[PDB]
Unconditional design. Structure first.
Lengths: 98, 108, 112, 221, 81, 362, 95, 104, 107, 94, 98, 80
DNA sequence: CAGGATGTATATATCTGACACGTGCCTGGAGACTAGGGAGTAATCCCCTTGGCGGTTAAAACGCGGGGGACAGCGCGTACGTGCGTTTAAGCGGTGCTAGAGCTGTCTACGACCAATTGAGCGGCCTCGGCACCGGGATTCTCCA
DNA sequence: TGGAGAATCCCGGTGCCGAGGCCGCTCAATTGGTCGTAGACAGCTCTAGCACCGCTTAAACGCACGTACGCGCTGTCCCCCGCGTTTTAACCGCCAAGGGGATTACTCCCTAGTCTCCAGGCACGTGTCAGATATATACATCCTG
């Protein structure tokens, strides 16, 4: 009962651990299924290879982790701390990619 | 007849293979009469530039008490430094991770 | 037309085949009888008695007509007695304006 | 005025026309205009010289109304049931339409200005020189035709408008003579004047008899 | 195989936001993140296949993937050269 | 003479305000029908073509018989000739980002007009019953483009038409048409060519029946602008003195072609001849005699006589070419019987020789 | 049959092993320098095809490439990269 | 074919129309038929040059071309001075007036 | 022997010069040999892309009712189409300007 | 004297075959000329890279067909490959 | 009194003309002086072609006028309508070129 | 010598109006002056570094577009 | 709500310089031919994608209590927008001028090509030591009184 | 101002697998020679960067003043965050099948290189018509009452 920390402390203690860490965070096989599923609308009967799927997570999660990091810079400018979908739609427009 | 050979990299003063590059370049369509200034420039320049990316690992490995240099330390030893991170920031270094950073309004 | 002996050289009394036409200024223009009879004055005059004898002098002087005028009258007669009843294109009869101004008097003077 | 030299022909008028005013006037298509109608004048022209003129009265309209000359080989009732140009259709026959265009030989030429309601037109013919001349409103338009020698003709006029009429105002004949030929040549040499009697001591009785014989020549160009 | 896009879970999208340094989160964003990853993937996989067709192969291999990232300026060092 | 024509022009003219009183009834119907149609995905942009005067009044003696035309604006399209007929085309879409108009009317690749009209018929037919303050009824089909026709009570009546609008350069088949240059100067020719153009649905027809799925060009908006602004001087008829008989000469000519059909409708041989042909011959004529000086009110006679002269000449020779598509022969043996043509010359030339008897019936 | 394949390893190694004597390197720490040097190759060889047609120069030679490497390395490192390719234009010229 | 011509001497100014093939001697036969002086007692001159009776007027250049209907060409007659040609006995016509400016 | 010169553009039906594109693809230092079909295929895709642009610019120019195309009408045509704008996304057309919009909360 | 060469006539000929009635100012021609130069060089750059990737010594229809459906977005790629294939068969069949 | 427009109604008449015109907004001579004076400490006594100057100006206008547009979207997201130096410093680091 | 104060208050305003902004702070002017000078400092350094291969004493339009094209700023209108 | 004052749209009429043409001619695009070697094919083989199995326990889905972040509404005085009067520096038309980039004849120094030799670096087998990993004792910092 | 979980900073011993070293050999780099045209130069010429001089009026500077925006504060109630429970699906280690990516032999038809000829682009230079400009009038909008 008594130890329960004040809200928003555990949300700072856990960013430190993931910024020291270096491994990859999307669960592996659930992404491997999606890349064969999404490919089928361009061509058919098509084989992959281990290093062709492994290199493709490294491409994906490295752009998601670089996106959130300046949505977080947009919410603070609006005098907030909670991230919400109106913010990411600003970030991926100042980033030119529309 | 047939005197002892002297390597044409040593004849230009380089470490880089002025031999190997001249094959690549002259078969590579990029120019037609490959005057020795060209296998030598494409070889020469990159000497320091191929070491900087592990030289600056003295900022990482010995400092962190490790004696085998590794991809994470090679990542930090590029993505750490002032101009290094503009000089080659437009590229992702695989298995690197990211630098420690928190914004000042969010902490107690 | 050759060897024109005509039994007597001509018909020069009752049917006188040429008639002798002097102008006031003395030019003489012989005309063949249908050309003579083309003038109403001349056919009336040739219808006169005594002129039908072979002894007649079939002559006139036109005291009212000068020679240049009388030439065009003869030209007009020779033209019309040729070209009358022509089925082919009759040629024009141009006469010089610089001398022709008077010639309408010949119509009333000679009945032409 | 002096009495004209030929009437419209009672025996040679089409099956749809009334001759009138002592055959000086004529009328066409008094109801239906169900075809073309025409007449000749009573006199064949083929000797000497001729001159005549026509006054219009009903307003012009319809396919073609025209004036001209032709042989006896024409048929006044071929087009009894049909609109056609009867004059100008053949080597036999010529005519001028109110639109200012001639026909001959089954072909056309533009020749003059137009003419309409109340107009007056006059025509000269010389059979000796085988040639034909057109006048409007006491002024000359030009020589129409030549090379016409020894061919025999009647004068013909044709109609197609309903309720339409025309009248010959004068028609005349002459021989060739000095008073014809010399007077023509004289008028070719002074056509610029409105008159020809000017400057002449020539008797007023002779001036009047050429007003009779060649009334146009002395006073038109 | 179908509908593996729902295999991008809430807590995986939370792990990726910890490395971005973000503290509180709206419950609407998990349906937005899975909307941007969908079109990241498409423009990469739709070029690795065009290299493969030009090669006339049936297999797809790491070099085709790095030629794809490289083409669109996301170039990566560590799987080839 | 000219007094008969001046009189019949008044007797035509003074009927006009009855049309103006009738025009209120159709207005409410067309306004409701637009508000019906704009609800449907297939028609959301549809609109009145003749803005500011919501009808065309296509028969001058029929003051209850309106015509209405709806423009349906379409993005960007490609066209090709049916059977080298020059005036008739198949149409197909091209490069367009994802904003489908109604590709559901596509069949293989052609946009089906027959599918379009099938829906257009139905949606008007199910709507029009809900007009409750007025008796209104749809009248059965006659032909390709006016396939919806409508009656209010037992008088006020409408044919409804639809067309595609396109914004693009006009086809190469019209390049030599619209010979306006000497009449109205090149500066207006170019700026008139700087407008949209229209396609109307029309089957080809044959001994085998018909190529049902085809379109034909249309230029009626331009045609109105010429006639409205008809002077070599801009101010022609824009003041009382600068008046000219051009407009008068055309409307007199339209009226005649109905009167002769009234007297021979039982023979059926004249039925193929329309006020469309009458306009087309008039444009060649005013092109031929283009200075405003020829069109004094003190004429009227010769210009009207020139129209019948020109029309007779065309009709004898089986030749009348479209004024915009300068080689498409409307009078051709393919489209009209020789017998009807020669018969009509016999009628018209009889009327001319009889000094226009039929206008005495007014 | 065996189909032999090369890398830059020994030439970068001789510019590095001057500074840190007391170290070794894992396999996944080699590919980053291979792909760097190989990236610059076809990018500067493309610049060389351009340089040739820029100043009508079919004999490419040192001084035409030169500009690209005072350019591509920002800061005083412009001097570092160009110094390597300029210390080359001496001895070979004299056999 | 006969050619319109005019024969001129002294008073005489005589129109004639002879076959183009006629000898110049046949002109003398025609002249005797009109003027009774026999064919040899007569002589002929063209402009003011002697012409032989043995010729034909066609070879002497007197022809349908010289025979215009209103200008049948002139020929010089002679009646012998017993031994020779006499004078070219020509005499002038009455001088015609000017056409006045009122006619111009 | 030397017969008449029939140019390749007329055979494949292009307006683009099948001859000049061959010489440029030879001289430009792209590869060792140039195949026979490359200058035909390439001139056909450069035809398609230029033809697609020119009529969209023409439609804007003609509704703005001018005789000539100008850089403002190119901008308004390309910068206003979902897939031309994607194809040329990072290029500044000299003297084109910007297409107008006001952010809705400023009104 | 020294001589210069351009795409100017051919783009003018294409214009005069879709708006066969509309002109272009000299400044507006300059942009169209730089546009076709950019697109040629993008396509040729992936074609030369494809030939290197796949170890070959020539550029042919097979190379450019992949570069077009690689550098062109969405339905422009779908249309451009038809304008390509239909123009070469018209040539090999002549 | 006489005709005063209310604050804001002349500012909207302004953006609604600069968004429908083509030309340069900075003066010629003042931009030329700055370019020569920045240059004279890389090397001495350079010369410039006139179109090299115009190519620098056009590249700078389009850097600034495109950076203010991202600055506007930043200030509006924070519920303001007035731009401030704290918005410039946001745009330059989400745009990320630093 | 200054010359950076040659970009006036109303010039910096017109740039913001074409960019779509309605109302402006007063400290903006000395902020933009520090941003513009650091842009020109980098493109001029590359264009003069090209001008030395090209041998000339004059900086050309094509030297500056090689530097823009190298920075990532392609530009239709001046040729090349 | 009506009525005034102001800024924008438009439509002739004027004038001048930018675009579409005609032509002299020259140099680069078609015609013919042939001498090699790049690419096409048919046959081969073996390693590496593929699909399957039970399994351990790490990780995800669910729920539930309540703290403080998101946000509405209220007060407010300072900073900026509108507009009038003065005055100063960008832009214009015309002169000069010579510093510098472009063209070219010519000749000699450099890089492509070749055959024969042998040194540099690549592929395969080996083995100990660098840095992980399992229990773990010591040493901080937040959250309540 | 005292507590007590989470590590975490640092440590012990253990273990293994991967990186650092050695050998065989073959194939690609070099020596020595021959050869042909690129480009390094000395002159010439003529055009484009720099510099100067008045004039005009356009717009940058300086000021007053009113008002609506930016800025602070308060209350409250939604909407997450921190914890325990039940379970379901990764990662895992291992395995049997067979598909096509990677390698060779050999044949030939496609291309580059050559010579010749000649017609389609290029540089040049006159004309005229598409748009910029001025002035007058029609119209749509904002603001005070
Ligand atoms: Zn009028």
């Amino acid at each position: 009962k008594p130890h329960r920390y004040r809200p928003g402390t555990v949300a700072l203690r856990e960013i430190r651990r993931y910024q020291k860490s270096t491994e990859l965070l999307i669960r592996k096989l659930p992404f491997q299924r999606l890349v064969r599923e999404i490919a089928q609308d361009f061509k058919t009967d098509l084989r992959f290879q281990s290093s062709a799927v492994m290199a493709l997570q490294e491409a994906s999660e490295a752009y998601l982790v670089g996106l959130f990091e300046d949505t977080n810079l947009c919410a603070i400018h609006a005098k907030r701390v909670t991230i919400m979908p109106k913010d990411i739609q600003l970030a991926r427009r100042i980033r030119g990619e529309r | 007849a047939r005197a002892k050979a002297k390597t044409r990299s040593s004849r230009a003063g380089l470490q880089f293979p002025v031999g190997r590059v001249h094959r690549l370049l002259r078969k590579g369509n990029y120019a037609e009469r490959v005057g020795a200034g060209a296998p030598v420039y494409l070889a020469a320049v990159l000497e320091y530039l191929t070491a900087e990316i592990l030289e600056l690992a003295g900022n990482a490995a010995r400092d962190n008490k490790k004696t085998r240099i590794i991809p994470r330390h090679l990542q930090l030893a590029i993505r750490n430094d002032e101009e290094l991170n503009k000089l080659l920031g437009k590229v992702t270094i695989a298995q690197g991770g990211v630098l420690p950073n928190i914004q000042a309004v969010l902490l107690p | 037309m050759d060897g024109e002996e005509k039994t007597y050289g001509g018909c020069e009394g009752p049917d006188a085949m040429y008639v002798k036409l002097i102008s006031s200024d003395g030019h003489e223009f012989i005309v063949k009888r249908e050309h003579a009879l083309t003038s109403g004055t001349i056919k009336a005059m040739l219808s006169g008695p005594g002129q039908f004898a072979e002894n007649e002098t079939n002559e006139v002087n036109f005291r009212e007509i000068p020679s240049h005028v009388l030439s065009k009258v003869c030209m007009y007669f020779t033209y019309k007695v040729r070209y009358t009843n022509s089925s082919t294109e009759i040629p024009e009869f141009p006469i010089a304006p610089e001398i022709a101004l008077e010639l309408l008097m010949a119509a009333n003077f000679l009945d032409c | 005025d002096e009495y004209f030299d030929w009437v419209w022909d009672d025996l040679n008028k089409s099956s749809a026309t009334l001759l009138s005013c002592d055959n000086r006037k004529v009328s066409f298509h008094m109801e239906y205009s169900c075809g073309t109608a025409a007449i000749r004048g009573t006199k064949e022209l083929g000797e000497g010289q001729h001159f005549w003129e026509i006054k219009m009265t009903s307003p012009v309209y319809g396919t073609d109304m025209m004036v001209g000359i032709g042989t006896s080989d024409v048929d006044l009732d071929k087009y009894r049931h049909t609109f056609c140009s009867l004059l100008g259709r053949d080597e036999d026959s010529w005519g001028l339409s109110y639109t200012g265009l001639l026909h001959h030989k089954g072909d056309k030429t533009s020749f003059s200005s137009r003419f309409g309601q109340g107009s007056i037109i006059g025509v000269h013919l010389d059979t000796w020189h085988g040639t034909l001349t057109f006048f409007k409103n006491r002024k000359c338009i030009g020589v129409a035709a030549t090379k016409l020698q020894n061919k025999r003709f009647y004068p013909m006029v044709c109609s197609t408008a309903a309720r339409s009429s025309m009248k010959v105002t004068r028609s005349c004949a002459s021989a060739t003579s000095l008073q014809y030929l010399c007077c023509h040549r004289l008028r070719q040499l002074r056509p610029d004047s409105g008159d020809t009697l000017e400057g002449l001591p020539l008797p007023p009785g002779l001036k009047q008899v050429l007003h009779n014989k060649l009334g146009w020549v002395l006073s038109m160009s | 195989l179908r509908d593996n896009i729902q295999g991008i879970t809430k807590p995986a999208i939370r792990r990726l936001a910890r490395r971005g340094g973000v503290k509180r989160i709206s419950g609407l964003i998990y349906e937005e993140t899975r909307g941007v990853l969908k079109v990241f993937l498409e423009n990469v996989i739709r070029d690795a296949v065009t290299y493969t067709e030009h090669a006339k192969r049936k297999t797809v291999t790491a070099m085709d993937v790095v030629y794809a990232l490289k083409r669109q300026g996301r170039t990566l060092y560590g799987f080839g050269g | 003479g000219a007094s008969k024509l001046r009189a019949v022009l008044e007797k035509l003219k003074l009927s006009r305000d009855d049309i103006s009183t009738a025009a209120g009834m159709v207005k409410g119907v067309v306004d409701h029908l637009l508000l019906r149609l704009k609800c449907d995905s297939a028609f959301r942009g549809v609109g009145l073509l003749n803005t500011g005067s919501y009808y065309e009044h296509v028969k001058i003696s029929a003051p209850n018989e309106f015509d209405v035309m709806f423009k349906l604006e379409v993005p960007r399209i490609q066209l090709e000739e049916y059977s080298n007929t020059r005036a008739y085309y198949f149409v197909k879409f091209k490069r367009n980002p994802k904003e489908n108009p109604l590709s559901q009317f596509l069949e293989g690749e052609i946009l089906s007009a027959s599918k379009m009209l099938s829906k257009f018929r139905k949606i008007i037919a199910e709507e029009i019953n809900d007009i409750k303050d007025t008796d209104v009824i749809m009248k059965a089909k006659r032909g390709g483009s006016p396939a919806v026709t409508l009656l209010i009570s037992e008088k006020i009546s409408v044919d409804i038409t639809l067309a595609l609008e396109s914004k693009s350069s006009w086809p190469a088949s019209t390049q030599e048409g619209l010979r306006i240059q000497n009449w109205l100067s090149a500066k207006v020719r170019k700026q008139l060519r700087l407008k949209p153009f229209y396609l109307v649905p029309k089957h080809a027809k044959e001994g085998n029946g018909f190529q049902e799925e085809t379109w034909r060009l249309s230029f009626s908006h331009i045609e109105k602008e010429i006639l409205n602004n008809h002077g070599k001087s801009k101010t022609c008829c824009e003041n009382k003195e600068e008046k000219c008989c051009r407009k008068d000469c055309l409307k007199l000519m339209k009226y005649l072609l109905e009167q002769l059909k009234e007297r021979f409708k039982d023979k059926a041989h004249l039925d193929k001849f329309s006020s469309y042909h009458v306009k087309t011959a008039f444009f060649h004529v005013c092109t031929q005699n283009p200075q405003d000086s020829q069109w004094d009110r003190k004429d009227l006679g010769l210009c009207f006589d020139n129209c019948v002269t020109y029309f007779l000449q065309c009709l004898r020779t089986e030749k009348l070419e479209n004024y915009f598509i300068p080689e498409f022969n409307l009078f051709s043996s393919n489209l009209i019987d020789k017998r009807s043509k020669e018969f009509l010359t016999k009628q018209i030339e009889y009327e001319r020789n009889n000094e226009f008897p039929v206008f005495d019936e007014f | 049959k065996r189909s032999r394949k090369e890398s830059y390893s020994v030439y970068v190694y001789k510019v590095l092993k001057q500074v840190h004597p007391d170290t070794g390197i894992s396999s996944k720490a080699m590919g980053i320098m291979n792909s760097f040097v190989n990236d610059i190759f076809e990018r500067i060889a493309g610049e060389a095809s351009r340089l040739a047609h820029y100043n009508k120069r079919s004999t490419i030679t040192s001084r035409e490439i030169q500009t690209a490497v005072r350019l591509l390395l920002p800061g005083e490192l412009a001097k570092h990269a160009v110094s390597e390719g300029t210390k080359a234009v001496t001895k070979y010229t004299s056999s | 074919m006969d050619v319109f011509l005019m024969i001129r001497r002294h008073k005489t100014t005589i129109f004639t129309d002879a076959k183009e093939s006629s000898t110049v001697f046949e002109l003398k036969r025609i002249v005797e038929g009109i003027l009774k002086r026999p064919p040899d007692e007569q002589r002929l001159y063209k402009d003011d040059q002697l012409l032989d009776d043995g010729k034909t007027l066609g070879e002497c250049g007197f022809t349908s071309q010289t025979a215009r209907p209103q200008a049948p060409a002139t020929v010089g007659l002679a009646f012998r001075a017993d031994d020779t040609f006499e004078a070219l006995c020509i005499e002038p016509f009455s001088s015609p007036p000017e056409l006045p400016d009122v006619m111009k």
